[PDB]
């Protein structure tokens, strides 16, 4: 319908406005079709997953250098490491996304991972590099939508 | 159209993202299809209605236990009673929503209401129970959209 | 489709909810189909344009008295002048929007503009009136979407 087109125009405009306000005020970061945001809290891995899922999203995980840089900027902004959305396989050294798929893009800090299976989780340093670590530390909660 | 379907997908995704960010940061609470939010201000009944209507919403009113609990959490978060969207009928003891319909769900604190017609408004204690009270007190402004 | 209509209803409702929350909390101001918002930062003209464009919007510019009043309220809220989206033509005294079109609506403070071509930018005083000024001062960044 000619009216359907105009209705969609207004809808898209309003979305742009709301997303623009959130972006301008630093409430969220947009990279491609992914949106990253934090509540500023520092809690453990399980708690982060819960906070994100409750908000309708998921604990963040970078799959491209650009996405990695975005999360890194948030970690730097709050000066704290960030737990990423991935866990170690049965075979130490190998990690998978929470959906089970094997991790593709990686940005390990030189020498990592080397937890020998004792560090199932992955944290991001403020410079963007990763380190396998235990899952009970308090880390900045960053979600992706 | 095949293009209409994809366009709608993106629109729905963006809405999820914006709602997710607002939710994650505690800017609003979602219960079913209703959204509750506050500006943190404590003013009287008439002022609250104005603030909500100006924002495109209405002074909040719970119609289910779950909705009641949501508003109660906000009242507890700011440690202040909340005026609800309802007023006393001509017949003391009977209350109606601002649209005129008789109140169905209620959660009166034991013994309430007992203002004998001198307390036309309804405030929510931080534990979620209600009390009929005058409309000139300063209460947390909670709106529903 | 009957389903397309219902899907659109929900979409429009959600947008109203998100816009309502942003409005209630003072994150943005809505005037007609235009949305104004600020990140609270005070920087020069070029920096403001960049901040706005990066957020998906543009440095604000009022085209009606109502739009002017909205921006003025933000300037007053933060107690700081606001750079507007317009620059002086080659012919001193004449200004155009950043798209090149000649400025229509104006609200110059009595006597302005009188920079004689040395003040290419336009700033808004907290009372809403304008003054042509250099573009290197630090002014409140207000964007429109
Ligand atoms: O605290 C654990 C942490 O300590 C150091 O940073 C390194 O040995 C890391 O590989 C290890 O994960
Ligand atoms: O301040 C008025 C308020 O006082 C007490 O809380 C009770 O008597 C309530 O029923 C009444 O509404
Ligand atoms: O600082 C420059 C500024 O000074 C005064 O406010 C007036 O002369 C203005 O016209 C001029 O733009
Ligand atoms: Ca390690
Ligand atoms: Ca009472
Ligand atoms: Ca001047
Ligand atoms: Na390990
Ligand atoms: Na009463
Ligand atoms: Na000039």
């Amino acid at each position: 319908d000619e009216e359907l087109q105009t209705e969609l125009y207004e809808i898209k405009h309003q979305i742009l406005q709301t997303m623009g306000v959130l972006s301008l005020q630093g409430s969220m970061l947009s990279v491609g079709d992914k949106v990253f945001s934090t509540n500023g809290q520092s809690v453990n891995f399980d708690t982060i997953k819960e906070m994100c899922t409750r908000a309708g999203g998921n604990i963040a995980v970078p799959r491209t250098p650009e996405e990695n840089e975005a999360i890194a900027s948030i970690a730097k902004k709050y000066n704290n490491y960030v737990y990423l959305g991935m866990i170690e396989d049965q075979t130490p050294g190998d990690f998978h996304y929470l959906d089970g798929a094997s991790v593709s893009y990686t940005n390990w800090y030189p020498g990592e991972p080397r937890g020998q299976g004792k560090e199932k989780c992955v944290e991001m340093y403020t410079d963007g590099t990763w380190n396998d670590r235990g899952c009970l530390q308090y880390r900045l909660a960053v979600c992706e939508f």
Side-chain angles (χ1 to χ4, degrees), chain A residues 40-56:
Chain A
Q41 296 300 306
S42 291
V43 296
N44 62 42
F45 183 83
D46 286 351
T47 303
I48 297 177
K49 292 190 301 179
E50 193 290 307
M51 303 177 145
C52 296
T53 58
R54 189 214 312 162

Side-chain angles (χ1 to χ4, degrees), chain A residues 108 111-116 119 121 123 125 130-134:
Chain A
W108 297 110
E112 301 299 325
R114 56 185 176 73
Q116 268 54 297
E119 305 180 302
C121 283
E123 50 178 24
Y125 290 154
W130 316 347
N131 168 53
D132 62 321
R133 184 69 173 281

Side-chain angles (χ1 to χ4, degrees), chain A residues 3 5 16 51 54 66 86 90-91 114 120 129:
Chain A
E3 181 183 302
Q5 182 64 55
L16 178 153
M51 303 177 145
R54 189 214 312 162
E66 177 172 47
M86 52 178 64
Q90 291 291 53
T91 293
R114 56 185 176 73
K120 305 282 288 185
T129 63

Side-chain angles (χ1 to χ4, degrees), chain A residues 3-70:
Chain A
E3 181 183 302
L4 178 280
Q5 182 64 55
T6 182
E7 204 173 311
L8 290 181
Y9 171 76
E10 189 170 359
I11 288 173
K12 290 176 293 187
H13 183 207
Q14 297 173 306
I15 288 174
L16 178 153
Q17 298 178 311
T18 59
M19 297 193 86
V21 170
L22 292 172
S23 177
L24 176 67
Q25 310 194 318
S27 306
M28 61 177 219
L29 278 178
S30 186
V31 177
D33 283 1
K34 185 175 292 186
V35 167
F36 297 116
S37 182
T38 177
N39 54 24
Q41 296 300 306
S42 291
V43 296
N44 62 42
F45 183 83
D46 286 351
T47 303
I48 297 177
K49 292 190 301 179
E50 193 290 307
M51 303 177 145
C52 296
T53 58
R54 189 214 312 162
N58 294 93
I59 182 174
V61 67
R63 294 169 186 273
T64 71
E66 177 172 47
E67 287 185 7
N68 198 82
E69 288 160 36

